[PDB]
Each structure stands twice: as C-alpha cells, then as structure tokens.
Amino acid sequence: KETAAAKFERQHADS
Amino acid sequence: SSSNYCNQMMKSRNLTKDRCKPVNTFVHESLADVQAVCSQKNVACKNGQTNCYQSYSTMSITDCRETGSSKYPNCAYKTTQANKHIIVACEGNPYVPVHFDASV
C-alpha cells in the first residue's frame, strides 16, 4: 500500500 | 473536470476522483533532482519542525487552485505556471521528500 514517499510522488511530481 | 492540465492531472493522479482538493502543486523536474533537495538548504518548516529543505535553484512548477465556482463532482481549477524554489519536508532512509511545505 502507499508509503508517504510514494504519495508525495503521485501527488506532486510530473517528470 | 475539463481539458486544462490541472483538471486532467488532478483527476489522473487520483486527487479529485472522490473529492475536490483546494490546491495542489506539481513539479516539472526529474524525480531524482526533486529528491536531491533533501540535502540542500535546511530551513525550519511552517510548523517549526526542522526537517525542511529549500532548493538552491528555482524549479518549474504548476499551481492548481480550485475556482470559486468548483463543486464536487465537477472540480474546476485555475492553472498557474511559475518557476519557484520548493521547500519540502524530508524523512526516511533514504531521506526523501514526504510533504511539500511551500514554493518561494
């Protein structure tokens, strides 16, 4: 299930 | 929920599939360069905790903010593109960004 680091990437990174 | 970048990405990244989130920032940089900020300028977080870090340089970002007329289910966003220094709170091992504290 989603870690906090994974959640930050899904919500905020658009490489 | 329409064709602009914020309405599309907030939906695709599962931020507005079940609620309208008021504001969200997307960073248009490589993931490892965003992760590199956790060893850059240490600063206090808004809440006084000290695990926040500020990027040395500005990064390309898009701010998405709900308009005054937005209501679930039809979330509506104003899109603002800018280059700003990002401040992120870091944790873990590896020490990576876990929260966005601000853009400056």
Q: Give the determination technique.
A: X-ray
Structural domain boundaries enclosing B92? 1-104
The answer to whether B67 and B77 have CB atoms below 8 angstroms apart is: yes
The beta-carbon neighbor of A12 closest among B26, B30, B96 is B26
Q: Is the peptide bond before B73 cis (omega within 30 degrees of 0)?
A: yes
How many domains does one find in chain B?
1
- Closest of B64, B67, B80 to residue B13, by C-alpha: B64
| A12: nearest CA partner in chain B | B26
Residues of B in contact with A8 (CB under 8 A): 88, 96-100
CATH number of residue B94's parent domain: 3.10.130.10
Report d(CA B76, CA B9) in Å as an integer.
12
DSSP per-residue string spanning B45-98: -TTS-S-EEE-SS-EEEEEEEE-TT-BTTB--EEEEEEEE-EEEEEETTTTEEE
The number of C-beta contacts closer than 8 angstroms across A and B is 41
